[PDB]
Design a protein around this ligand. Structure first.
Ligand SMILES: O=c1ccn([C@H]2C[C@H](O)[C@@H](COP(=O)(O)OP(=O)(O)OP(=O)(O)O)O2)c(=O)[nH]1
Ligand SMILES: O=c1ccn([C@H]2C[C@H](O)[C@@H](COP(=O)(O)OP(=O)(O)OP(=O)(O)O)O2)c(=O)[nH]1
Ligand SMILES: O=c1ccn([C@H]2C[C@H](O)[C@@H](COP(=O)(O)OP(=O)(O)OP(=O)(O)O)O2)c(=O)[nH]1
Ligand SMILES: [Mg+2]
Ligand SMILES: [Mg+2]
Ligand SMILES: [Mg+2]
Lengths: 193, 193, 193
């Protein structure tokens, strides 16, 4: 059961669900709230490494991720991020989202974006109960034309689903959770497994 | 919570949602209804433009969009659409779908298709409350062989999820809604933001 | 709704839902169960065929399917599968999963993976009521680095949604279902349509 727009407004009103800054009524409809693009981005630099060993020694994985991730890219005013066909980039939503333990959220892209080849995630769009933070985005342009992305644009949408009950281990209270306190285009923390 | 098959036929019989034409009992099972491929397609014309500035001057973007998008392709019966690896294309389902204000629909591809690298949407699969119209698809071949696509083939599935209540701003009533009355392989209307 | 972590535990304890080997409490949290990578893979031998005609003479298709799919790749103790950028491969979960008739399953990748461009499915992540088998994965590396994938790594997560009622045609009973008894990296059976 997804929350319809009126119920999202009420959960936002009771305050155990928070989205900061809260999108206006124009941006809450049907069963979704729209989200916008922030100004933090990351690209990859392959020429430093042959591969990343997802399960190799923790220490060596940490080194690798550091050699292939650029530092965080912040665009100056009026500047766009040019997302080219075939070139994965990280970003973040403008909004920070905080979910109570009895709710899960799901991120969609936008049909208007899909129709130009823009994926907003890479088969990982689940915002967990306990989640608090901005939501990281994995952009892939599967299209034929580069796309200029500007901070501020409508980039995705969130739907919300009350759970059968309060999660007994929500994200915020879980010791090996990787991304609590998320805020920019944070790179993979696969080396934490 | 999704409608089981029996309830889907029950909502169909009582007119609480429509699928036109209505798939036979063979294509309604578990918690889904299969949909079939339409015969309208669109490709992209990269050479005519450098890039698309998703949230730039409306006239610019609008014009760019009209430059890079093919006219609508209608297959002469028997004809195939050859979807090559690397080549995004727009299409549409055979079926028209109409959803009430208290239900959201979700498009799936097919495992049989996935195992050949065919994506049927680019992170945009939500069919909104109040929606009425044929569903546009975004085909991307991530695999290693060209795939011949013909009208009338089984291309995906829809599952339906009642909302916590009736949406106050459902799609058919939102005035900045982009794709109401969509009945073909309609291009992105991202300029309309 | 989806089952909160407790309730997942309830259904495993009750027993109509089953996951073998049952993941420890630690890999069950929020609204999901974590699933792990199996040791069976398949690749594509493109040079043996010009294309696959998704809805051509059954004959034609199976042979072409047979010609393009590799012999299963079985990784033995301490081995890696190198998934290079742009090279679709088939794989499977470690876990076998059985869903009762009144439950639907949904596969997600992992954010940690997503941020290095690994998709774990190609728009086909629904696990059907009546399903009993290992879950096949469709890996696509959309990033810029090769990724070493080792059997037993955390590769994804499942969440569960109870249905409005028991499906009248669940997977295990549906005569034309293609993938029951799935115990490895099973190729597309689009020719059985
Ligand atoms: O796979 C899909 C998904 C969506 N749509 C339709 C159904 C949905 O109700 C609508 C709007 O979807 P979305 O909000 O993702 O697209 P948008 O680009 O944001 O358009 P709008 O500004 O109208 O929200 O487009 C399709 O035709 N095919
Ligand atoms: O990530 C997934 C998703 C699905 N499947 C399995 C589960 C599901 O119940 C079954 C059928 O899926 P679907 O209906 O999408 O595929 P199909 O190609 O239409 O096969 P069928 O004719 O069996 O419906 O395949 C997997 O192995 N992995
Ligand atoms: O599109 C998304 C999806 C998820 N996340 C966040 C929300 C979520 O609750 C968290 C963890 O997601 P997941 O469990 O898929 O990733 P992980 O790689 O397994 O990390 P962890 O070890 O923390 O579970 O990351 C995002 O920032 N953007
Ligand atoms: Mg929208
Ligand atoms: Mg199916
Ligand atoms: Mg996780």
């Amino acid at each position: 059961m997804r929350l319809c727009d009126r119920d999202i407004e009420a959960w936002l009103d009771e305050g155990r669900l928070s989205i900061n800054p809260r999108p206006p009524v124009e941006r809450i409809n049907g069963a979704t709230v729209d989200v916008r693009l922030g100004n933090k981005f990351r690209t990859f630099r392959g020429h430093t490494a042959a591969f990343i060993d997802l399960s190799g020694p923790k220490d060596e994985v940490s080194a690798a991720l550091d050699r292939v991730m650029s530092d965080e890219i912040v665009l100056d005013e009026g500047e766009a991020f040019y997302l080219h066909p075939g070139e994965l980039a990280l970003a973040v939503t403008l909004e920070s989202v905080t979910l109570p333990a009895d709710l899960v959220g799901w991120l969609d892209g936008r049909s208007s974006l899909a129709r130009l080849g823009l994926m907003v995630h890479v088969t990982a769009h689940r915002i967990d109960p306990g989640w608090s933070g901005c939501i990281v985005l994995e952009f892939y342009n599967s299209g034929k034309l580069p796309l200029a992305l500007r901070p501020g644009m409508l980039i995705g949408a969130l739907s919300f689903e009350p759970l059968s009950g309060p999660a007994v281990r929500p994200y915020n209270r879980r010791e090996d959770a990787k991304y609590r306190n998320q805020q920019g285009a944070v790179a993979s923390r696969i080396d934490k497994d």
